[PDB]
Subunit: 495 residues, 3 copies
């Protein structure tokens, strides 16, 4: 009786008819349909957002997403340790909530539990039931975590958590969140995050990347659609002054973007980008930017060489550095913006070919693994599958040589940023002019933007070695110029 | 003729009769017995303290203790290197002898040679015969080391060595050391350490943990007995307002503690504790505390959250920090005090189940390995033996995740301690009030106590992850409070 | 017709007749011989310097030199990273070109391409054709690199490259370089390095260590011959007041040194030494030392305990430290001077026994591998071949224990150098006397000389553990003495 439904749901008919999902009865994914027919539109069907329904017919994708693996080096790797990805984090991000805890990423199945449990999220309120011995448990959020309650305190935590955070950890609010988190849905940007978390039972849904109605490759992330719509000819995913995205707006309430061809650069860019999803400060007037402002659910889709101008253009910065008071941008995991225009991107390779390589399940049916892969741990399938002349050692050597050269420049950029910050403090105590301190703040802004992008980004340059070198040497140059003018100004005081 | 002996040695009769050692002739372990009978009590039998006698009937325990293994990452691992367990050691312990050399522990068979050869012991006087190529040799101290003599100098060494040090490296002085090292035995706390070392041929004896007379599980360490006796109802080993320890006092000269049931927490706490075994300074008057003082052979049996109050209560600190002049506690390897009240302790698991797992020897007789094990190197026997559902990768993941999270907080506590020390120095040079510097010293004391415990402790939180988090975040909080008040006081000067 | 040639080339006759190469026709290695005979000496034969000619009869040496191996940890390892061999490089070498890039060494076949491509060589002018994916290519320089041209800029590079650099990367200029690079050959010390690089097609030739005429073990490096000639009785290679080197001077233009017996300490010392091959400054007058000066192609052949006196004696230093203005020596890879007088040197072991171990080729003919080996990666052939009682773990344990103890002192020397530099800067800002700052500069000179030798040297003490300890503790002592007098002078100012 789908034609009954299709009478008032025309877009679903468009997606589903003559699709690979054509035959699937509406009842497979929607409950209370009879009540919706019999009692009218006031009584909504139930749409349970649930990987297990997709798994009933796609077991290898479902099984590989939920498969539990144990990295013998462990997880919860703080980045701000000496041998870590961001060893000078505590000094360079002084005054930012990331100083409370920032760990390396792990598997997709953990993404909700790790967002809720991190020391920077909600003052330690959410914890693993049974603690560390259950840290590898997957499945339903509230089977895994407990709520210690609103009045509990945990020392050296922060309260960075907000509803927009959840948009990059789950598909559970797809029908309960108006476009951009503007008011009108069950939840919006101004919601109490502790109401929102109760609604999040699952990590990123199968529906995040795949239309349930027709199985079309798609995106559902509001900020990513908004970015592509703002710059449809020149954005990082465009080709020929066009992007492969048809936006479907349901009821003026929620958008999807459907693509004719798989583009995992867009599918993964739903989360693996720089974003603003937090309050901040305007550069002009020093006024707060609150969750009322659309800038608190924002995808720039700009790379390291563009972001400082981009955030100046939209009159926004994240935090003042606790020492220099520089109006700093906080960068997060810009993998899509890094990958854009790199050797592999230009070759037509997409994120999924390295990170979701082909494996065989079960009997021996071929599928894309949905347990996303760390290519250095799987070079036969992530690399040699395409680079057939490569030995495993050659693949590892190529990854690690690029990471080696890039990290050399990252560490040198940190040395110089640390020097800039320490010299600034000395310049302050030597009563150097606030005019000249302001010049140094600008150099800190620039050096910071060209450095922090790369500790935030997860490849240590592999995704774009040229951009990483140009950015990080630009950071070093800016810091050296700041240190020179501060040390010059310090001579001129006592001259 | 044991009844002859038993006439004047009543306690030995109590331990030996109806024991597992009942049948063993006194002559097996004591020489010159006839002269002792014939010439009377003036001529003492010879009691050679020697693992090889125990080995004659317990070959697998003896063989596994002396087995030579080569860790391919080497030994003599200085902790104060960037990638090391205590990377900011040289700054945070400035003014302490540990800045001359402090390496990670290795195997028990090396414990005397490594105490005598470390650069902080006795000005480099003791060295390996033939140098590095013999660094893996086990057996008799003076087959392995040479004495360069009292007048030899070795640059960048220290003279921390003292007789009480030897009490945690050998059973060789069991009959030659009056309780607590008070005067009356061949050696006491005031002895020249260079006389004492000549008497130490073996590492920790079989008799350290096992009664030779009846084979009862026991302790012989004077400071550990003294601690248990001071607090017999509430100490970390107690249960039901009682400790499983019967103290036997021989001649008012030397004590053992015998337990009805194996408690390796007590057996290992003979050495794996925080201790004071060194001169120090009183907090009240600034007067020396010398080896005449019982506080120089002292076991607090207190954890990270208790030690600062404990050392304030007994009016003792180890060193003034070379920069801040904070009256600091020097912490050493508090494994027993950490382990106390942890998940595994509460489950009735003891040190030996993870560190002396069951292995098969020879033919295939089952025994507890007496080559103590680093569980991460042996997860099948140290972990999976009990956690039967664990894979080796799961065991490794669980150890390393806890170490990862704990080290993140350890490194952050060091960052903030370094900031506190650097800010203090700036506050001094900005002529901030000595009143306010004194407030900052108190914050350094607190931050130091809540940090250094964990670099001194060897598990990086595994033994008590909750206590480690509470302590290390407390350290960070104290340092941040010190940095705030110093930076506030620095504004107020030039206000 | 060799007797025709031998008439005017008497030294070649001496080397070639009754040699292992006796039978080889001159035409095998020299072209245009008929024109040289027919047209006279004005028309020089062509002498193509080329491993492939040697390879025609020595395939296993040729094949093993050019064999491509992929270290899975990658290459281009910057030393100035936290976990790196020289973690405080950027601070301690501040004002030296090594701060732009200094990576660990890799295989011999890469030595030209890596010299030309390093960020410190020639402003990034030379790059790998096709970039990173060709970083493992071996063979001809200009098949592997491209020239971006003289006007191209690459941010955060330096221009350290000069002709004398090439003398330790290739045998290609053996007939085109007058002794010491004095004027008269196609190239000299004053040549434009960008003319010189065009002439360098190959890495170190077979002829670097082996005479082509008679196959005698030899050296061709001008600076090494000059050093041995200056001190023929007491130099590090001497025995019995004599060195095994007969110098043959061709035309007063170019020297070789031929040895009766293989001495790989000399063969490898052609490059694995400290050297001066750069402009610098005189200590006395502050005058430049230019490529006109013989001190710009100089081998001291002195160890860590001798170099500071050595460079003071010849009135030379490399750079003023950017903070302290200390007149610092820049140290490079002093492996031969370190190895001299070590346990293995005294035992008659040479570099080649550990680094060119015996392997079997082809069928199974035994040869010395000419792919030089990192012994920790090959302990069966580099170590156990001679230490037959060693297990692989024992060999690794011995290497890594020595490296562990040595690195502990290296890291501690860096901590104290960093403290010296930071204290100096504070002493300057507290207006401490320039007299007392000059005293501290001397302590920085000394501490620097006794430290940087060991980050420059590649064994982390393995080659001479006693010398490393004596040097690095001497560094620590010098820095502590500098920090004491600066901190004392700072009290005395405000006294
Ligand atoms: C017109 C008379 C309708 C027929 C026939 C069916 N549906 Fe419907 N549906 C209709 C309206 C006007 C609305 C919602 C209006 C609003 O914005 O609240 C709905 C809603 C749904 C939803 C809910 C989406 C959400 O916000 O959670 C679902 C999943 C849905 N409808 C499914 C559906 C099916 C499967 C039908 C045939 C059995 C069907 N609808 C008939 C209008 C009408
Ligand atoms: C938002 C819903 C996401 C989308 C869409 C994708 N990723 Fe992701 N990823 C995300 C998070 C929040 C995490 C961390 C989870 C945690 O609990 O820490 C990650 C992690 C990865 C990793 C690391 C995997 C691991 O270490 O085991 C990789 C390699 C990764 N992500 C890649 C990736 C690719 C290629 C995507 C498109 C196919 C993709 N992600 C989508 C959030 C989201
Ligand atoms: C999409 C644009 C995102 C928004 C909005 C937020 N997060 Fe995120 N998160 C995202 C990705 C792709 C990843 C994996 C890659 C990485 O660099 O981590 C993550 C990871 C986390 C993690 C795990 C790692 C860590 O930082 O400890 C946490 C704890 C996490 N994210 C929390 C978080 C919070 C609290 C947010 C709102 C302030 C938030 N995320 C927004 C993608 C996106
Ligand atoms: C092969 C050419 C790749 C493509 C295309 C993309 N990625 Fe990648 N990624 C690659 C490597 C070699 C590495 C280094 C670390 C490693 O595991 O080898 C990375 C790193 C990441 C990470 C960090 C997690 C990890 O896998 O270790 C993330 C989160 C990641 N990459 C995501 C990502 C996205 C979203 C991509 C398309 C925009 C992308 N990668 C492309 C190799 C390749
Ligand atoms: C009473 C007449 C004795 C008989 C019979 C035996 N022993 Fe004895 N023993 C006795 C005294 C009074 C002392 C020492 C007094 C003092 O404090 O110095 C001893 C000493 C020993 C020791 C020495 C312990 C030490 O300090 O090193 C040993 C090992 C010992 N005695 C053993 C022993 C044995 C095996 C006997 C039967 C053969 C024996 N004793 C008889 C008193 C008497
Ligand atoms: C080895 C297995 C032993 C046998 C058999 C016996 N004794 Fe022993 N004894 C032994 C050791 C290693 C020591 C040192 C202290 C310790 O507790 O480990 C001793 C000590 C004694 C002492 C001294 C007690 C004191 O007064 O302080 C006596 C008096 C003694 N041993 C007597 C003794 C007798 C009489 C035995 C036969 C019945 C006998 N011992 C057996 C080791 C061993
Ligand atoms: C004092 C006599 C000790 C007793 C009793 C125990 N241990 Fe110990 N341990 C001690 C020292 C002095 C050393 C270092 C030795 C050196 O030369 O460096 C150690 C070392 C260990 C180690 C590390 C083992 C290794 O790295 O190979 C472990 C795991 C260890 N110790 C555990 C341990 C346990 C479980 C004990 C009770 C059974 C125990 N120790 C007793 C000193 C002493
Ligand atoms: C028991 C309460 C002890 C006293 C008293 C002393 N040491 Fe110790 N030591 C002890 C243990 C359990 C261990 C292994 C665990 C660890 O954290 O090291 C050690 C180890 C050493 C080592 C090896 C490691 C190192 O620090 O380089 C040395 C060199 C050592 N101990 C020396 C030493 C000295 C000189 C003492 C008196 C000042 C001393 N120890 C006392 C247990 C105990
Ligand atoms: C299993 C539940 C354990 C019990 C009970 C105890 N220890 Fe432990 N210890 C454990 C782990 C997983 C680690 C981390 C390092 C590792 O090797 O895996 C440790 C560490 C130590 C160390 C450092 C040496 C080492 O083994 O690497 C010491 C010296 C040590 N532990 C001693 C010790 C003592 C005395 C215990 C009872 C109080 C104790 N451990 C209990 C696992 C477990
Ligand atoms: C004397 C009449 C000669 C006979 C017969 C041969 N050679 Fe010669 N050769 C001679 C002179 C005077 C010179 C060079 C003078 C100068 O310094 O320029 C040469 C040069 C060579 C070289 C060049 C070395 C260089 O600088 O590149 C080679 C390789 C050489 N000669 C080889 C050679 C051979 C193989 C001969 C027999 C066929 C031969 N020479 C004959 C003088 C005379
Ligand atoms: C100058 C012509 C050289 C001579 C003669 C020798 N070596 Fe060398 N070596 C040299 C350079 C310039 C490099 C670095 C090359 C690069 O592209 O980075 C090296 C490297 C080595 C290494 C490291 C090998 C590797 O990592 O794979 C070793 C162990 C080494 N060299 C040893 C060595 C020995 C033993 C020699 C005499 C037989 C020797 N080298 C000669 C420059 C030169
Ligand atoms: C012989 C006395 C040498 C002179 C003159 C120069 N180099 Fe060198 N170089 C030499 C050796 C034996 C090695 C390998 C050992 C090591 O410690 O690196 C090297 C290595 C390099 C490398 C690779 C490693 C690195 O530093 O990044 C480069 C890029 C290199 N050398 C460049 C270089 C330049 C530019 C020189 C003139 C200023 C130069 N070298 C001189 C031996 C010798
Ligand atoms: C065995 C007794 C050796 C002799 C003789 C020499 N070297 Fe060595 N070298 C040795 C070890 C164990 C190490 C440590 C790093 C390792 O790979 O194990 C080294 C290190 C080097 C290096 C650094 C590159 C490397 O191999 O990792 C160089 C460039 C090197 N050594 C050169 C060298 C020269 C020129 C020697 C004679 C003067 C020399 N080595 C002797 C072991 C031994
Ligand atoms: Ca951001
Ligand atoms: Ca202590
Ligand atoms: Ca030099």
């Amino acid at each position: 009786g789908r034609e009954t439904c299709y009478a008032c749901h025309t877009e679903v008919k468009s997606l589903k008819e003559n699709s690979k999902h054509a035959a699937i009865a509406c009842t497979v994914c929607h409950d209370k349909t009879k009540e919706h027919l019999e009692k009218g539109p006031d009584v909504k069907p139930v749409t349970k957002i649930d990987q297990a329904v997709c798994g009933s017919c796609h077991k290898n994708q479902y099984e590989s997403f939920y498969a539990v693996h144990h990295d013998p080096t462990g997880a919860r790797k703080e980045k701000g340790i000496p041998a870590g990805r961001s060893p000078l984090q505590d000094k360079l991000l002084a005054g930012h909530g990331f100083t409370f805890e920032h760990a390396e990423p792990r598997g997709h199945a953990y993404m909700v539990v790790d967002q809720f449990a991190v020391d920077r999220f909600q003052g330690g309120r959410y914890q693993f039931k049974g603690g560390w011995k259950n840290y590898d448990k997957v499945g339903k959020t509230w089977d895994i975590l407990e709520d210690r309650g609103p009045n509990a305190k945990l020392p050296e935590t922060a309260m960075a958590g907000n509803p927009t955070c959840i948009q990059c950890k789950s598909s559970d609010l797809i029908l309960q969140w108006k476009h951009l988190g503007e008011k009108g849905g069950k939840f919006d940007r101004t919601s109490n995050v502790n109401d929102v978390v109760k609604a999040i039972n699952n990590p990123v849904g199968c529906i995040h990347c795949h239309d349930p109605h027709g199985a079309q490759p798609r995106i559902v992330r509001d900020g990513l659609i908004a970015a592509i719509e703002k710059d449809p000819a020149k954005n990082i995913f465009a080709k020929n002054g066009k992007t492969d995205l048809k936006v479907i707006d349901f009821r003026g309430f929620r958008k999807i973007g459907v693509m004719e061809k798989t583009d995992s650069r867009m599918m993964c860019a739903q989360c693996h980008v720089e974003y603003n999803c937090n309050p901040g400060t305007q550069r002009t007037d020093g006024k707060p930017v609150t969750f009322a402002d659309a800038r608190t659910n924002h995808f720039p889709l700009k790379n390291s060489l563009q972001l400082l101008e981009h955030y100046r253009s939209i009159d926004f910065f994240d935090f003042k550095h606790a020492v220099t008071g520089a109006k700093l941008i906080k960068f997060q995991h810009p993998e899509a913006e890094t990958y854009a225009g790199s050797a592999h991107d230009k070759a037509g390779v997409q994120c999924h070919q390295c990170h979701m390589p082909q494996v065989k399940g079960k009997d021996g049916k071929k599928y894309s693994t949905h347990g996303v892969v760390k290519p250095i741990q799987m070079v036969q399938e992530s690399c040699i599958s395409c680079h057939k002349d490569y030995t495993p050692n050659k693949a590892k050597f190529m990854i690690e040589t690029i990471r080696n050269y890039t990290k050399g420049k990252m560490r040198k950029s940190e040395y110089w940023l640390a020097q800039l910050i320490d010299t600034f403090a000395v310049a302050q105590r030597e009563g150097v002019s606030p005019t000249i301190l302001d010049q140094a703040r600008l150099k800190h802004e620039e050096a910071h933007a060209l450095w922090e992008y790369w500790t935030a980004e997860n490849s240590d340059g592999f995704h774009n070695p040229e951009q990483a070198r140009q950015s990080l040497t630009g950071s070093i140059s800016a810091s050296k110029a700041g240190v020179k003018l501060l040390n010059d100004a310090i001579m001129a005081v006592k001259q």
